[PDB]
């Protein structure tokens, strides 16, 4: 097969900046090279074909260049909606192949999380399990430390996090941390607290409730 290698694997730049994405082929593909955008959970979208031709309806900030074994996709001035993985693809030979993608992240200004804590519902407790949820809403950058304390004891090994994809209009993230305990363990303790450390906060923030 003709192997397509993309670089960099990840690129983080602010709105308004110029982005240059590279695709290298293991042997010549002439100009038989296209570029696709894939935004989270939407269908892929053709951007460029025949190495340099902009597809219908694509904004003018997208352009492509190159031939042979070296190609570039340029976004002349990034917009928040450009958050996506970008792929090159050759049609010079079967099998058709794609590069491994370049993930473009939009580097916005620091935004602190809005933190909320949710007790388990009475309905769930009937089942014998208790889920406690801490939400960090609409923040940037992605890195955040979330610590659970039960009656002021730090918890380890009994929580799982999930993080949304970057928002296509405001470029923030949201994050959930779910602490899972036995009903019997939950009913033994009183104070449940989620402590959040983030670059947008001058000091860590804690949200708490008392069972009852």
């Amino acid at each position: 097969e003709i192997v397509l290698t993309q670089s960099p694997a990840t690129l983080s730049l602010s709105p308004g900046e110029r982005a240059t994405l590279s695709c290298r082929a293991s042997q010549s593909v002439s100009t038989y090279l296209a570029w696709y955008q894939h935004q989270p959970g939407q269908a892929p979208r053709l951007l460029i074909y025949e190495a340099s031709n902009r597809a219908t309806g694509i904004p003018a900030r997208f352009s492509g260049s190159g031939s042979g074994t070296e190609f570039t996709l340029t976004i002349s001035s990034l917009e928040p909606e450009d958050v996506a993985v970008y792929y090159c693809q050759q049609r010079a030979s079967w099998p058709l192949t794609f590069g491994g993608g370049t993930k473009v992240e939009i580097k916005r200004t620091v935004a602190a999380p809005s933190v909320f804590i949710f007790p388990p519902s009475d309905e769930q407790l009937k089942s014998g399990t208790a889920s406690v949820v801490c939400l960090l809403n609409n923040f940037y950058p992605r890195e955040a430390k979330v610590q659970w304390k039960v009656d002021n004891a730090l918890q380890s090994g009994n929580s799982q996090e999930s993080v949304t994809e970057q928002d296509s209009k405001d470029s923030t993230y949201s994050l959930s941390s779910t602490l899972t305990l036995s009903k019997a363990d939950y009913e033994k303790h009183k104070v449940y607290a989620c402590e959040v450390t983030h670059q947008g906060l001058s000091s860590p923030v804690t949200k708490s409730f008392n069972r009852g």
Binding site: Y36, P44, Y87, T97, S121, S162, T164
Partner: protein, 221 residues
């Protein structure tokens, strides 16, 4: 123009499954049609292409002899009939239309994707629990609420709020795989605290592998 895919879901290893892709708004007979898949956490992989006649088919080496691509121009539909499936075949499968008949790409229109999960584990529908907003003298001007969608297999689950009338401020989190082998996710939304006594909030949860449809009202207290 649209490509509408159908056929995804859970299938046993060693089993067979057929995907279909129906064209609307353009004549299928005028274009080469392809299947491209994305395994979890990985990139895009071309699977097969069919040109204008059913005998003009090309395949990835790893599916030759196992998968057959075909077309029915009279029904404006393309098919991928798969056999002898393995875990490596678990993926989001896209159909993709070429700009022309005589060449397989560029791919100028793509379907939304159908998830094929190759596994021996049984289907299980989720339980839905409220994430209730705080409604006290002492809470803030913005309230957060949600639904916890726990213990289901396979993916996916979809969530809407108020039958789709509420979209702004909604975040539906990627699912996490639990130690139990079942998935769980939450969907949250922020709203004005002044609205909590006035406005009903209902999360609409659908898990098609289990024919589960749940509307859960989320209220303070």
């Amino acid at each position: 123009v649209q490509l509408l895919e159908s056929g995804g879901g859970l299938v046993q290893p060693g089993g067979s499954l057929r995907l279909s892709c129906e064209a609307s708004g353009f004549p299928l007979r005028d274009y080469a049609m392809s299947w491209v898949r994305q395994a979890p956490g990985r990139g895009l992989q071309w699977v097969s292409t069919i040109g204008g006649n059913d005998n003009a088919a090309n395949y990835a080496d790893s599916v030759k002899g196992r998968f057959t691509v075909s077309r029915d121009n009279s029904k404006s539909t393309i098919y991928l009939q798969m056999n002898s499936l393995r875990a490596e075949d678990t993926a989001l499968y896209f159909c993709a239309k070429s700009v022309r008949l005589s060449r397989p790409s560029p791919f100028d229109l793509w379907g939304q994707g159908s998830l094929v999960t190759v596994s021996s584990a049984s289907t299980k529908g989720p339980s839905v629990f409220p994430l209730a907003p705080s409604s006290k003298s002492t809470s803030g001007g913005t309230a957060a609420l949600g639904c916890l969608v726990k213990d289901y297999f396979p993916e996916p689950v979809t969530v809407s709020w108020n039958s789709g009338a509420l979209t702004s401020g909604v975040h539906t989190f990627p699912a996490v795989l639990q130690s139990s082998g079942l998935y769980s996710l939450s969907s949250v939304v922020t709203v004005p605290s002044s609205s909590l006594g006035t406005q009903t909030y209902i999360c609409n949860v659908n898990h098609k592998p289990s024919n589960t449809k749940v509307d859960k009202r989320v209220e303070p207290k």
